[PDB]
Structures are given as structure tokens and as C-alpha cells.
Amino acid sequence: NKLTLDKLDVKGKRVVMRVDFNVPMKNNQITNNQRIKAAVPSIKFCLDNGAKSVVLMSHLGRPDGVPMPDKYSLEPVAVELKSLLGKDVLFLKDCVGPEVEKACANPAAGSVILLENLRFHVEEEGKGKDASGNKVKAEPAKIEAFRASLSKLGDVYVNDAFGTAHRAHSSMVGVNLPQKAGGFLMKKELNYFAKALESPERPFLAILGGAKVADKIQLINNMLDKVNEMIIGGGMAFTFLKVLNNMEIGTSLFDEEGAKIVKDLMSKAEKNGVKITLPVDFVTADKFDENAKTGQATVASGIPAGWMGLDCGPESSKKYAEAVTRAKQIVWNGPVGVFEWEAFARGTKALMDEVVKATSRGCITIIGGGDTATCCAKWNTEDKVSHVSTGGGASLELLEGKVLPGVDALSNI
Numbered sequence: 001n002k003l004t005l006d007k008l009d010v011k012g013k014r015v016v017m018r019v020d021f022n023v024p025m026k027n028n029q030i031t032n033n034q035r036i037k038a039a040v041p042s043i044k045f046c047l048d049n050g051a052k053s054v055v056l057m058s059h060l061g062r063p064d065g066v067p068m069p070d071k072y073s074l075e076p077v078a079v080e081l082k083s084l085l086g087k088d089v090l091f092l093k094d095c096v097g098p099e100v101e102k103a104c105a106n107p108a109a110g111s112v113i114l115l116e117n118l119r120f121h122v123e124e125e126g127k128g129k130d131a132s133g134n135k136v137k138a139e140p141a142k143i144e145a146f147r148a149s150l151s152k153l154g155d156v157y158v159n160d161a162f163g164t165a166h167r168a169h170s171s172m173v174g175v176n177l178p179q180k181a182g183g184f185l186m187k188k189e190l191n192y193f194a195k196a197l198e199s200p201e202r203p204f205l206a207i208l209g210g211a212k213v214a215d216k217i218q219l220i221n222n223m224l225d226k227v228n229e230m231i232i233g234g235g236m237a238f239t240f241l242k243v244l245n246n247m248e249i250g251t252s253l254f255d256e257e258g259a260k261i262v263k264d265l266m267s268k269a270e271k272n273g274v275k276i277t278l279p280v281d282f283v284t285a286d287k288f289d290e291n292a293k294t295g296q297a298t299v300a301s302g303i304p305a306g307w308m309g310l311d312c313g314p315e316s317s318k319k320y321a322e323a324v325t326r327a328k329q330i331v332w333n334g335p336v337g338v339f340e341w342e343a344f345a346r347g348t349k350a351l352m353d354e355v356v357k358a359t360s361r362g363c364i365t366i367i368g369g370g371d372t373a374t375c376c377a378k379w380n381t382e383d384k385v386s387h388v389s390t391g392g393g394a395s396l397e398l399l400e401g402k403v404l405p406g407v408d409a410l411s412n413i
């Protein structure tokens with residue numbers, strides 16, 4: 001279909017490799033390195049297979065096309081990468097231009113080079129904001145030059161940046177080398193998602209959680225065409241409960257736009273035979289705070305208002321468990337409560353326990369990136385589910401049935 005790294009001859013070749021090293025940070029300290037580790041297999045393969053160089057490029061955060069070295073440098077990533085790889089990483093303070101080109105022209109065999117944040121240049125995204133905060137547009141000649149420069153850095157191109165595969169950015173689709181190969185991470189991610197979406201083992205359970213409904217309509221709709229069961233949890237559930245069940249939800253999140261289509265979505269489900277599991281009980285809070293006073297409510301009792309519901313309750317966890325038990329395949333995108341806070345994490349943790357249990361008995365368990373992946377780190381379960389995705393937005397696009405420009409741009413095999 002598409003050329004992949006396993007099929008690519010890299011011996012004695014400089015490999016310029018787009019990766020997603022857009023890792024969570026604080027005070028320029030990396031807080032989850034999951035994205036970095038995820039790329040190691042492609043990098044090692046290249047090295048073990050005689051690549052002259054591997055030049056790594058990524059964005060970090062949204063500097064919006066202006067240099068932000070004290071907020072968004074990849075320098076910390078170069079440090080973490082050397083540790084993961086047990087090899088030196090040469091960090092360049094830029095990604096394009098004559099000095100970087102000189103550095104990458106003919107490196108000593110086995111050289112690993114990490115470029116500075118691609119997004120310090122407006123050319124990468126093709127638009128951005130000026131240093132005064134005004135929206136600005138990249139210029140075509142400059143974009144071409146930007147792409148040309150990156151292109152100079154390797155003989156062959158590999159994209160392992162699954163997390164960025166939804167972005168038609170210069171580094172992702174604009175590289176002007178004839179051989180453009182998907183990396184092992186890109187391959188792995190797509191395989192699990194394809195199987196899940198094209199050819200699932202059944203029953204196929206989707207667990208969708210999150211705050212709002214409006215932004216998930218395509219996703220729910222598409223998933224309803226694929227799955228056998230769906231759990232809808234988190235903040236989004238209140239919209240369904242209020243509309244469908246007449247529930248009193250207090251101050252819990254309510255999506256007015258979403259409420260308009262909830263019925264239509266449930267109709268599709270019924271028509272398709274998809275069993276919907278909504279929460280039946282809740283952990284309530286008197287305010288939206290980590291340390292709020294908490295209570296308990298049922299759909300029938302209502303949320304006494306305007307208290308808000310911030311986790312599912314024990315009976316919900318039981319129904320969720322029952323669904324998990326039924327499943328031979330699961331895709332989980334979204335926590336079922338405010339997992340960030342211990343008083344409202346219980347539902348999420350229990351579900352994680354169930355998902356882990358399912359994996360141990362052969363359930364194919366796919367965790368969407370973003371918050372759900374974060375939970376995997378938090379509770380140390382990355383090696384206990386089948387797949388923890390590195391791409392939240394990207395994975396969501398696939399789940400919505402969308403094409404990834406980063407994949408499309410690869411060479412055909």
C-alpha cells in the first residue's frame with residue numbers, strides 16, 4: 001500500500017525523520033515521554049541497519065511560528081532521547097537554513113541529530129501569529145524554501161509522527177524526497193485502528209467520554225456504524241440523560257447544540273442494534289473543585305442542583321464492567337470522570353482495571369491518545385492494554401472516518 005521502513009534500504013543513507021515529540025511539559029521539564037519512546041524502534045532500526053544519520057524533526061506546543069526557545073524548545077527532548085537511546089543526540093538550535101544544512105550534509109556514520117522546534121517557523125504550519133499576537137500567513141516562496149531546506153537534510157524520508165498525521169504541515173506532507181516511508185509507529189498505529197474499524201473482533205465496544213457532545217457528533221455517528229456496543233460517559237452523558245431521560249442534572253455540563261441531535265443519534269443506535277450504556281449513578285460535587293464536598297446521585301434522584309456530577313458511581317462502574325466483559329475488542333477514547341482529581345477518578349480507575357482485565361483474557365484493547373493515554377501513565381498500565389495510542393487528535397480523525405494527510409503523502413508500495 002504505502003512504503004514502510006521495513007522495506008526501505010537505509011544503509012549508508014541519511015534519514016530525515018518526522019516524529020511527534022510534542023510531549024507534555026512543565027518548566028521545561030518533560031512530564032510524559034511516551035511519545036519519545038514510541039519512536040525509538042524506528043530510530044534503532046535505522047541505526048542497526050547502517051543509516052549514516054538520523055535527523056529528527058518535530059514541533060512542540062504551539063509557538064505559532066515565532067522562536068520561543070525558553071518555552072517551547074526541544075532541547076529537553078534531546079536530553080531525554082539520549083537517555084532512552086543510550087546514544088548521543090546532537091541538538092541543533094534551528095531546523096532549516098545553511099548552518100543546519102552543513103551539519104546534516106554528511107555526518108559521521110550513526111549520527112543522531114535532533115532539530116529545534118519546527119514551529120518556530122511560520123512556514124511549517126503555513127500560518128501563525130506575529131510576535132504581537134496578530135494572525136499571519138506564510139508566504140509561498142518561503143514555504144517552498146522551508147520545505148527545500150528540510151529536504152536537504154536526508155537522502156530518504158520517514159514519517160513516524162502518527163500524532164501529527166492529521167496535520168498537512170510542511171514537515172509532514174511537503175518533503176521533496178522520492179522515497180517517503182511510514183515508520184514503525186505510524187504502521188503500528190494504523191494497523192490497530194484499521195483492524196478495529198474495518199475488521200473488528202466482536203462484540204466491538206466503544207467507550208466514548210469527554211466534556212461536550214457537539215464536537216463529537218461525527219465520531220459518535222461513525223462509530224455507531226462500526227460498533228456493537230457503546231458506552232457514553234463523562235460530562236457528555238448529561239446531555240443524553242437530560243434529553244432522553246428527563247434527568248435533573250443540576251449544574252452539570254450541558255451541551256445545547258448537542259442536545260438537538262441526541263435523539264437522532266440514539267435512533268441510529270437502535271436501528272443499528274447498538275447497545276448504549278449511559279451512566280446510572282454519579283459522584284456529585286457542590287462546586288467544580290478538586291476539594292469540593294461530594295455526594296451521590298442516581299438518574300432517578302437527580303443531581304440536587306446546582307451540584308454537578310463529576311464521576312460515575314459504583315453501579316455505573318458495574319454496568320461498564322459488564323459491557324467490557326462482553327467485548328472482544330474495545331476502543332476507549334475519553335475518561336468517564338474528572339480523573340485529574342482523586343475524588344472523581346474512581347470511575348476511570350475502575351474502568352481501567354476492567355480494561356486491563358479484558359486484555360489479560362485476550363480482548364483487543366485500544367486506548368486513544370490524549371487523556372486516556374495519560375491515565376495509562378498515571379496508573380502504570382501501558383504494558384497492560386493492547387495499544388496505547390500516541391495520537392489523540394489524529395486517532396479521533398481516523399475514528400471519524402477521515403483521511404490522514406500525513407499517511408497520504410507517503411510513497412506507494
Ligand SMILES: Nc1ncnc2c1ncn2[C@@H]1O[C@H](COP(=O)(O)OP(=O)(O)CP(=O)(O)O)[C@@H](O)[C@H]1O
Pocket residue numbers: 209210211212233234235236253309310311335336337338339340370371392
Ligand atoms: N462529569 C464531568 N464533568 C465535567 N468534566 C468532566 C467530566 N468527566 C470528565 N470531565 C473532563 O473532560 C475532560 C476531557 O474532555 P474534552 O471533551 O474537553 O476533551 P479535551 O478537553 O481533552 C479536548 P482538547 O484535545 O482540546 O484538550 C477531562 O479534563 C475531564 O476532567
